[PDB]
Structure 1
Amino acid sequence: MQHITVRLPKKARAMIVGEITNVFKDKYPIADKLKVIPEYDVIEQDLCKLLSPGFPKQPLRVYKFGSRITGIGNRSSDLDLFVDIGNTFHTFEHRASNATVAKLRAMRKFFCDSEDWRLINFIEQARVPIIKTCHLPTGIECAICLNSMGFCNTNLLKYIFESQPLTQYMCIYVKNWLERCKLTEQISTYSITLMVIYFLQLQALLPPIAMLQIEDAANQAVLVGPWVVNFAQKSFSELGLQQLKATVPVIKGFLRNFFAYFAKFDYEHFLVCPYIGQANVEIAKIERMLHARYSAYVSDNPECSIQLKKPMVVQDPIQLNHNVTKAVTKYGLQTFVDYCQQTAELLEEP
Structure 2
Amino acid sequence: MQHITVRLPKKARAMIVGEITNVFKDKYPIADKLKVIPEYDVIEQDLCKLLSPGFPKQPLRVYKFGSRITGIGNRSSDLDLFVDIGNTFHTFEHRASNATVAKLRAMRKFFCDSEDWRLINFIEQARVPIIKTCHLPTGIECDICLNSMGFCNTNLLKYIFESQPLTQYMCIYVKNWLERCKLTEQISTYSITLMVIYFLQLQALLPPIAMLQIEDAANQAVLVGPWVVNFAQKSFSELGLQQLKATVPVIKGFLRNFFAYFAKFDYEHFLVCPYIGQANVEIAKIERMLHARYSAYVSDNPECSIQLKKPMVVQDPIQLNHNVTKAVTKYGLQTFVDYCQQTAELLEE
With the shorter chain as reference, the TM-score category is over 0.9
Please list the CA deviations of residues 40-59 of structure 1 after superposition, one character each: whole Å capped at 9, or x if unmatched: 00000000000000000100
In the aligned structure 2, how far is the partner of 1:86 from the partner of 1:229?
Answer: 19
The residue correspondences of 1:40-51 to structure 2 (distance < 5 A) are 40-51=40-51
In the aligned structure 1, how far is the partner of 2:181 from the partner of 2:57?
Answer: 48
**C-alpha deviation, 1:212, in angstroms:** 0.1
1:236 is matched with 236
In the aligned structure 1, how far is the partner of 2:194 from the partner of 2:206?
Answer: 12
In the aligned structure 2, how far is the partner of 1:226 from the partner of 1:147?
Answer: 14
In the aligned structure 1, how far is the partner of 2:134 from the partner of 2:302?
Answer: 39
Give secondary structure in 2 for the equivalent of 1:132.
strand
In the aligned structure 1, how far is the partner of 2:284 from the partner of 2:300?
Answer: 21
In the aligned structure 2, how far is the partner of 1:186 from the partner of 1:252?
Answer: 25
In the aligned structure 2, how far is the partner of 1:292 from the partner of 1:260?
Answer: 35
The residue correspondences of 1:248-263 to structure 2 (distance < 5 A) are 248-263=248-263
Mapped pair 1:288 → 2:292: no
**C-alpha deviation, 1:300, in angstroms:** 1.5
Mapped pair 1:87 → 2:87: yes
In the aligned structure 2, how far is the partner of 1:214 from the partner of 1:9?
Answer: 44
**C-alpha deviation, 1:113, in angstroms:** 0.3
Mapped pair 1:98 → 2:98: yes
**C-alpha deviation, 1:345, in angstroms:** 0.3
**C-alpha deviation, 1:139, in angstroms:** 0.2
2:316 is matched with 316
Unmatched 5+ residue regions in structure 1? none
**C-alpha deviation, 1:335, in angstroms:** 0.0
Give secondary structure in 2 for the equivalent of 1:294.
helix
In the aligned structure 2, how far is the partner of 1:319 from the partner of 1:118?
Answer: 32
Please list the CA deviations of residues 290-313 of structure 1 after superposition, one character each: whole Å capped at 9, or x if unmatched: 000001111122111000000000
**C-alpha deviation, 1:281, in angstroms:** 0.2
1:73 is matched with 73
Give secondary structure in 1 for the equivalent of 2:246.
coil
Give secondary structure in 2 for the equivalent of 1:153.
helix
**C-alpha deviation, 1:69, in angstroms:** 0.2
**C-alpha deviation, 1:327, in angstroms:** 0.2
In the aligned structure 2, how far is the partner of 1:175 from the partner of 1:44?
Answer: 26
Please list the CA deviations of residues 72-120 of structure 1 after superposition, one character each: whole Å capped at 9, or x if unmatched: 0000000000000000000000100000000001100000000000000
Unmatched 5+ residue regions in structure 2? none
In the aligned structure 2, how far is the partner of 1:297 from the partner of 1:345?
Answer: 44
1:120 is matched with 120
In the aligned structure 2, how far is the partner of 1:301 from the partner of 1:114?
Answer: 39
Mapped pair 1:271 → 2:271: yes
* Aligned pairs, number: 349
